[PDB]
Amino acid sequence: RPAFCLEPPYAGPGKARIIRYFYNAAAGAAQAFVYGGVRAKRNNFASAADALAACAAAG
Numbered sequence: 530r531p532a533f534c535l536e537p538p539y540a541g542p543g544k545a546r547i548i549r550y551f552y553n554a555a556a557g558a559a560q561a562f563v564y565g566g567v568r569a570k571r572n573n574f575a576s577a578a579d580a581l582a583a584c585a586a587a588g
Contacts, residue, residue, distance in 0.1 A: 543567035552584035
């Protein structure tokens with residue numbers, strides 16, 4: 530899987546309150562976090578499905 534999938538979630542310094550998903554490689558599962566709307570890192574998806582397609586795909 531891409532290295533970015535091993536990144537901890539990055540809420541960032543922003544004041545927005547947006548539910549996003551990261552791939553939690555330790556858990557082997559998608560997980561929700563609160564994203565602040567600025568300076569998103571790559572392990573940051575709109576849905577569990579998008580996180581899993583990026584980070585737990587075949588091949």
